[PDB]
């Protein structure tokens, strides 16, 4: 095609007899040969701009502090996981029975076995805290 000669940052313009016009403002074409340029991604509200849009590359979003990306190329934001939860790929989920997490942005680990260290269980744990062992 004649359009194949139009490089990234331009589009093959059907309104101007297939010349390679530059991408309009707020658009891009990452490959050559396109009949139009693609609208640049906007990172607003909970999203902030990680990488700005150029004529040859889309903008890329991450989440504002206190939040983290979920799915795709950061299609959603989610508040950082708290005590009693860990980040999975499907979001923040409660720790399963027998495990806990006592810190924000922490991972669920199993409860301490007090008997391994020759100690007794004074207080059983939950998803939010470890067992309290006692001599």
């Amino acid at each position: 095609d004649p359009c194949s000669n139009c490089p990234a940052g331009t589009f093959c313009d059907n309104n101007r007899n297939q010349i390679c016009s530059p991408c309009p403002p707020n658009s891009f074409s990452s490959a050559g040969g396109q009949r139009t340029c693609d609208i640049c991604r906007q990172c607003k509200g909970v999203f902030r701009t990680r990488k700005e849009c150029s004529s040859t590359s889309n903008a890329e979003c991450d989440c504002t502090p206190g939040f983290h990306c979920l799915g795709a190329g950061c299609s959603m934001c989610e508040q950082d996981c708290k005590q009693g939860q860990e980040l999975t790929k499907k979001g923040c989920k409660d720790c399963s029975f027998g495990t806990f997490n006592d810190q924000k942005r922490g991972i669920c680990r199993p409860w301490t076995d007090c008997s391994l260290d020759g100690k007794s269980v004074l207080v059983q744990g939950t998803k939010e805290r470890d067992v309290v062992c006692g001599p």
Binding site: V121, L122, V123, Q124
Partner: protein, 143 residues
């Protein structure tokens, strides 16, 4: 004089097994006349003189961790069980639980009475025996 006794449990933690008892009458709540003694090693009240006694016990529990603990706790008197009592621990909505049971029992000479605690509970740690309020008592009815 008279033939009677009242013992006060030492235990506070909900742990399955036989209870230990205070038997010194210098302690508040404790009574112990002649013909009745406490065997510390086996944790038994020993009845010397045979006869019919009104035997009772009571169990008070208090919630020691807020928002936690549920199930039930039982006492059993063994000379199977001559006397038994289960007290429900409510989930968190009131932080106490009481039980009382009493009965006429014929006791032989040298009869040894032991009391066993059993716990069917989630988050045991959240409840404890109210100190001074778990009691085994008896007094002689026969002349």
């Amino acid at each position: 004089q008279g033939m009677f006794a009242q013992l006060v449990a030492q235990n506070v933690l909900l742990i399955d097994g036989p209870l230990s008892w205070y038997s010194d009458p210098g302690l508040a709540g404790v009574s112990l006349t002649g013909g009745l003694s406490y065997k510390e090693d086996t944790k038994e009240l020993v009845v010397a003189k045979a006869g019919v006694y009104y035997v009772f016990f009571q169990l008070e529990l208090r919630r020691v961790v807020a928002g936690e603990g549920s199930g039930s706790v039982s006492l059993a008197l063994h000379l199977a069980a001559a006397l038994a009592l289960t007290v429900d621990l409510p989930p968190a909505a009131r932080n106490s639980a009481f039980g009382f049971q009493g009965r006429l029992l014929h006791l032989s000479a040298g009869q040894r009475l032991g009391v066993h605690l059993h716990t069917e509970a989630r988050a045991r740690h959240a409840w404890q025996l109210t100190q001074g309020a778990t009691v085994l008592g008896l007094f002689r009815v026969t002349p």
